[PDB]
Amino acid sequence: KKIGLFYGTQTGKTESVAKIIRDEFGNDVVTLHDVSQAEVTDLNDYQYLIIGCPTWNAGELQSDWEGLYSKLDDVDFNGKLVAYFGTGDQAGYADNFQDAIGILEEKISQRGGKTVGYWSTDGYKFNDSKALRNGKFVGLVLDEDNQSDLTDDRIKSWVAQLKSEFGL
Ligand SMILES: Cc1cc2nc3c(=O)[nH]c(=O)nc-3n(C[C@H](O)[C@H](O)[C@H](O)COP(=O)(O)O)c2cc1C
Secondary structure, eight states, X not given: OOEEEEEOOSSSHHHHHHHHHHHHXXXXXXXXXXXTSOOGGGGGGOSEEEEEOOEETTTEEOHHHHHHHTTGGGOOOTTOEEEEEEEOOTTTTTTSXXXXXXXXXXXXXXXXXXXXXXXXXXXXXXXXXXXXXXXXXXXXXXXXXXXXXXXXXXXXXXXXXXXXXXXX
């Protein structure tokens, strides 16, 4: 399909969000890939990518994304448009909120990927984040632990934005 959505999940929350994002695009447009089962070369099959990853253990990548991270230097993302989303806990991990998507975007952009889908920091309370880019997040940030009532509307807004930014 046109968009490849590569997610990792420890406790299932990022996966659940990935299915909502898929359905908001239309199932016809997005193929889901759990990175526990992916090879880094699977990223080659798409010109439009969505990267999903929760932050774990106070600022670490989810472990399946950690595995792939180490091979991202073997892939060329030039010519691709890449968006990012994560789930995280702004209350419990205020100093590391959504660090994982920041870490992934730094790597993939240095490997040539162009980030699309920057997201306002309005409505979140946190101390620091590697996903911060001067007053915007590098992608959609969800918090199912503290703000689950806001997820659906956040996804609808973000996906509309991505359909425009991807030029669909
Ligand atoms: C031990 C532990 C550590 C966590 N560390 C972070 C963190 O550093 N930053 C963050 O934003 N969220 C942190 N979280 C919150 C998780 O990212 C959040 O629960 C997320 O929805 C999990 O997604 P998953 O179910 O897809 O694995 C942590 C949660 C646990 C239980």
